[PDB]
Design an enzyme around this catalytic site. Structure first.
Site, PDB file in Angstrom:
ATOM      1  N   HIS A   1       5.391  -9.860  -8.105  1.00 53.65           N
ATOM      2  CA  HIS A   1       5.283  -8.722  -7.149  1.00 53.65           C
ATOM      3  C   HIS A   1       3.912  -8.684  -6.476  1.00 53.65           C
ATOM      4  O   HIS A   1       3.834  -8.272  -5.325  1.00 53.65           O
ATOM      5  CB  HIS A   1       5.551  -7.395  -7.874  1.00 53.65           C
ATOM      6  CG  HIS A   1       6.844  -7.372  -8.603  1.00 53.65           C
ATOM      7  ND1 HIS A   1       8.058  -7.423  -7.954  1.00 53.65           N
ATOM      8  CD2 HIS A   1       7.113  -7.282  -9.918  1.00 53.65           C
ATOM      9  CE1 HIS A   1       9.026  -7.376  -8.845  1.00 53.65           C
ATOM     10  NE2 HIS A   1       8.468  -7.294 -10.068  1.00 53.65           N
TER      11      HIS A   1
ATOM     12  N   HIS B   1      -5.032  -4.837  -8.527  1.00 56.28           N
ATOM     13  CA  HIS B   1      -4.149  -5.696  -7.740  1.00 56.28           C
ATOM     14  C   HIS B   1      -4.226  -5.238  -6.285  1.00 56.28           C
ATOM     15  O   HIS B   1      -4.818  -4.203  -5.976  1.00 56.28           O
ATOM     16  CB  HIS B   1      -2.707  -5.624  -8.281  1.00 56.28           C
ATOM     17  CG  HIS B   1      -2.161  -4.242  -8.171  1.00 56.28           C
ATOM     18  ND1 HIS B   1      -2.323  -3.305  -9.158  1.00 56.28           N
ATOM     19  CD2 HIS B   1      -1.491  -3.619  -7.174  1.00 56.28           C
ATOM     20  CE1 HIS B   1      -1.790  -2.165  -8.766  1.00 56.28           C
ATOM     21  NE2 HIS B   1      -1.274  -2.304  -7.547  1.00 56.28           N
TER      22      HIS B   1
ATOM     23  N   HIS C   1      -1.829  -4.936  -2.380  1.00 51.36           N
ATOM     24  CA  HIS C   1      -0.607  -4.960  -1.558  1.00 51.36           C
ATOM     25  C   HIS C   1      -1.044  -5.456  -0.187  1.00 51.36           C
ATOM     26  O   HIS C   1      -2.120  -5.038   0.295  1.00 51.36           O
ATOM     27  CB  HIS C   1       0.059  -3.583  -1.457  1.00 51.36           C
ATOM     28  CG  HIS C   1       0.338  -2.985  -2.787  1.00 51.36           C
ATOM     29  ND1 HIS C   1       1.579  -3.051  -3.383  1.00 51.36           N
ATOM     30  CD2 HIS C   1      -0.450  -2.326  -3.658  1.00 51.36           C
ATOM     31  CE1 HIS C   1       1.511  -2.467  -4.582  1.00 51.36           C
ATOM     32  NE2 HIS C   1       0.280  -1.999  -4.769  1.00 51.36           N
TER      33      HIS C   1
ATOM     34  N   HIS D   1      -5.795  -1.594  -5.391  1.00 52.09           N
ATOM     35  CA  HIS D   1      -5.530  -0.539  -6.392  1.00 52.09           C
ATOM     36  C   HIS D   1      -6.225  -0.896  -7.689  1.00 52.09           C
ATOM     37  O   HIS D   1      -5.854  -1.898  -8.327  1.00 52.09           O
ATOM     38  CB  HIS D   1      -4.025  -0.407  -6.662  1.00 52.09           C
ATOM     39  CG  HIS D   1      -3.282   0.199  -5.522  1.00 52.09           C
ATOM     40  ND1 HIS D   1      -1.881   0.100  -5.345  1.00 52.09           N
ATOM     41  CD2 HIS D   1      -3.792   0.881  -4.462  1.00 52.09           C
ATOM     42  CE1 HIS D   1      -1.608   0.749  -4.220  1.00 52.09           C
ATOM     43  NE2 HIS D   1      -2.745   1.228  -3.668  1.00 52.09           N
TER      44      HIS D   1
ATOM     45  N   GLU E   1      -0.304   0.563   1.704  1.00 51.00           N
ATOM     46  CA  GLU E   1       0.744   1.482   1.231  1.00 51.00           C
ATOM     47  C   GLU E   1       0.431   2.871   1.782  1.00 51.00           C
ATOM     48  O   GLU E   1       1.227   3.440   2.527  1.00 51.00           O
ATOM     49  CB  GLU E   1       0.797   1.422  -0.294  1.00 51.00           C
ATOM     50  CG  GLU E   1       1.212   0.053  -0.797  1.00 51.00           C
ATOM     51  CD  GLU E   1       1.906   0.101  -2.137  1.00 51.00           C
ATOM     52  OE1 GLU E   1       1.296   0.613  -3.093  1.00 51.00           O
ATOM     53  OE2 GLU E   1       3.073  -0.377  -2.197  1.00 51.00           O
TER      54      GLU E   1
ATOM     55  N   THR F   1       3.583   3.216  -7.176  1.00 53.34           N
ATOM     56  CA  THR F   1       4.232   2.816  -5.920  1.00 53.34           C
ATOM     57  C   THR F   1       5.223   1.657  -6.123  1.00 53.34           C
ATOM     58  O   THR F   1       5.842   1.225  -5.128  1.00 53.34           O
ATOM     59  CB  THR F   1       3.231   2.392  -4.855  1.00 53.34           C
ATOM     60  OG1 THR F   1       2.648   1.162  -5.287  1.00 53.34           O
ATOM     61  CG2 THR F   1       2.198   3.456  -4.576  1.00 53.34           C
TER      62      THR F   1
HETATM   63  N1  LIG Z   1       0.783   0.216  -7.208  1.00 54.74           N
HETATM   64  S1  LIG Z   1       0.351   1.121  -8.439  1.00 54.74           S
HETATM   65  O1  LIG Z   1      -1.088   1.094  -8.545  1.00 54.74           O
HETATM   66  O2  LIG Z   1       0.983   2.409  -8.324  1.00 54.74           O
HETATM   67  C1  LIG Z   1       0.990   0.395  -9.939  1.00 54.74           C
HETATM   68  C2  LIG Z   1       0.183   0.326 -11.092  1.00 54.74           C
HETATM   69  C3  LIG Z   1       0.691  -0.254 -12.278  1.00 54.74           C
HETATM   70  C4  LIG Z   1       1.987  -0.753 -12.334  1.00 54.74           C
HETATM   71  C5  LIG Z   1       2.463  -1.482 -13.579  1.00 54.74           C
HETATM   72  O3  LIG Z   1       1.903  -2.540 -13.883  1.00 54.74           O
HETATM   73  N2  LIG Z   1       3.510  -1.037 -14.279  1.00 54.74           N
HETATM   74  C6  LIG Z   1       4.246   0.182 -13.990  1.00 54.74           C
HETATM   75  C7  LIG Z   1       4.181   1.136 -15.187  1.00 54.74           C
HETATM   76  N3  LIG Z   1       4.462   0.474 -16.477  1.00 54.74           N
HETATM   77  C8  LIG Z   1       5.199   1.052 -17.435  1.00 54.74           C
HETATM   78  O4  LIG Z   1       5.729   2.132 -17.266  1.00 54.74           O
HETATM   79  C9  LIG Z   1       5.356   0.343 -18.755  1.00 54.74           C
HETATM   80  C10 LIG Z   1       6.548  -0.323 -19.051  1.00 54.74           C
HETATM   81  C11 LIG Z   1       6.708  -0.967 -20.275  1.00 54.74           C
HETATM   82  C12 LIG Z   1       5.695  -0.941 -21.211  1.00 54.74           C
HETATM   83  C13 LIG Z   1       4.516  -0.279 -20.940  1.00 54.74           C
HETATM   84  C14 LIG Z   1       4.351   0.361 -19.726  1.00 54.74           C
HETATM   85  C15 LIG Z   1       3.764  -0.809 -16.645  1.00 54.74           C
HETATM   86  C16 LIG Z   1       3.984  -1.696 -15.463  1.00 54.74           C
HETATM   87  C17 LIG Z   1       2.785  -0.702 -11.178  1.00 54.74           C
HETATM   88  C18 LIG Z   1       2.307  -0.103  -9.993  1.00 54.74           C
HETATM   89 ZN   LIG Z   2      -0.482  -0.915  -6.335  1.00 57.31          ZN
END
Ligand SMILES: NS(=O)(=O)c1ccc(C(=O)N2CCN(C(=O)c3ccccc3)CC2)cc1
Ligand SMILES: [Zn+2]
Length: 260
Positions: A65, A95, A97, A120, A107, A199
């Protein structure tokens, strides 16, 4: 999430996410357009404190992603505090976008303006003990968002650019020690803040967003390298990792506050 199938394609992109993640239509989704005229100065916001001097980067990962630069978050090392935040938030990863063209990729938008990319820096609230518990809380995460525009090179970004050749495809990682995230910050810490969400799926409503007003400049060559990454795994048909952004979501019952 071994059965997740979401992405940024026509058949699995943002307009589809609500089917597996109904919170996609929730009351505090991110990103949003920042209407600069409607955002109100909040004199009650405390100073913002970005303390990255002891940051310990470990690894860079292509997760299919985006790519994540991961930090050791097993001690208070790199922390975000102040501004709208109560308590201490530990840096876990950053990371980006970005777009297929310089006119899109961010975003958040500012008066409907899209930047070429958005950084981010993801932090979790230490009162919840671990990242997985923090994402289940309305004040679990603080994400510091920084816009990228194309112009002059960002010298502090080049170490990231050069390692991308080694993580071209989904699931590849590389050692990435001693990277200093202070080299990705603009001069000013003026910001907007609002309550929002992740997001990407699972789109959890756990984030205090802090979006800096001043963008950083990166060169056309730096962002072109981002666009040579692949969404696909090794030995699969090439799909360039571009346009990995969610568009702006309804503001609903929220106010965006300005630090300035
Ligand atoms: N673009 S963002 O900064 O809103 C963002 C930040 C972190 C993440 C991310 O890496 N995850 C989403 C949340 N997430 C969980 O809910 C999770 C799932 C499984 C185990 C532990 C945590 C971990 C993976 C995705 C988007
Ligand atoms: Zn992000």
């Amino acid at each position: 999430g071994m059965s997740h199938h979401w992405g940024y394609g026509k058949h699995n992109g943002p307009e589809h996410w609500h089917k597996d993640f109904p919170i996609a239509k929730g009351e505090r989704q991110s990103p949003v357009d920042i209407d600069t005229h409607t955002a109100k100065y909040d004199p009650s916001l405390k100073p913002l404190s970005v303390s990255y001097d002891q940051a310990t980067s470990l690894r860079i990962l292509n997760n299919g992603h985006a790519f994540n630069v991961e930090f050791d978050d097993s001690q208070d090392k790199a922390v975000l505090k102040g501004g709208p935040l109560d308590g201490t938030y530990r840096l876990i990863q950053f990371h980006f976008h970005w777009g297929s063209l310089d006119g899109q990729g961010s975003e958040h938008t500012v008066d409907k303006k899209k930047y070429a990319a958005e950084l981010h820096l993801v932090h979790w609230n230490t009162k919840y003990g671990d990242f997985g518990k923090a994402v289940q809380q309305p004040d679990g995460l603080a994400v510091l968002g920084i816009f990228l525009k194309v112009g002059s090179a960002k010298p502090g970004l080049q170490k990231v650019v050069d390692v991308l050749d080694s993580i071209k495809t989904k699931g590849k990682s590389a050692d990435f020690t001693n990277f200093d995230p202070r080299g990705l910050l603009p001069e000013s810490l003026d910001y907007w803040t609002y309550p929002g969400s992740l997001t990407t799926p699972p789109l959890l409503e756990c984030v205090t967003w802090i979006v800096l007003k001043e963008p950083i400049s990166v060169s056309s060559e730096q962002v072109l390298k981002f666009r040579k990454l692949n969404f696909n795994g090794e030995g699969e048909p090439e799909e360039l990792m571009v346009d990995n952004w969610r568009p702006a979501q309804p503001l609903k019952n929220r106010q965006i506050k300005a630090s300035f």
